[PDB]
């Protein structure tokens, strides 16, 4: 009775959507690019030395 009218589906929309999300909200503007590490360019030194 609750499924044919979607009360249970709204409760599925209730409990998994109210807990806060982890989606594009931290993939959108919670990135800044780092400097290069030594390990990114380390193998040039091994060829050098």
């Amino acid at each position: 009775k609750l499924s044919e009218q979607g009360v249970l589906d709204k409760l599925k929309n209730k409990w998994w959507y109210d807990k806060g999300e982890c989606g594009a909200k931290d993939s959108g503007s919670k990135e800044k690019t780092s400097a290069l590490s030594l390990s990114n360019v380390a193998g040039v030194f091994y060829i050098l030395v």
Partner: protein
């Protein structure tokens, strides 16, 4: 686990050019160097 930034390899600098290019550079490094040698043999001037 949510995959993170991977550990960079020791050869990670040659990543932006694929393996077949780096061979075709050196093979053309030799081939131009060979032909440049044979050009200057025949010509004094």
């Amino acid at each position: 686990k949510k995959p993170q930034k991977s550990k960079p390899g020791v050869f990670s600098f040659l990543d932006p050019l694929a393996y077949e290019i780096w061979m075709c550079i050196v093979f053309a490094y030799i081939g131009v160097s060979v032909v440049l040698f044979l050009v200057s043999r025949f010509s004094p001037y």
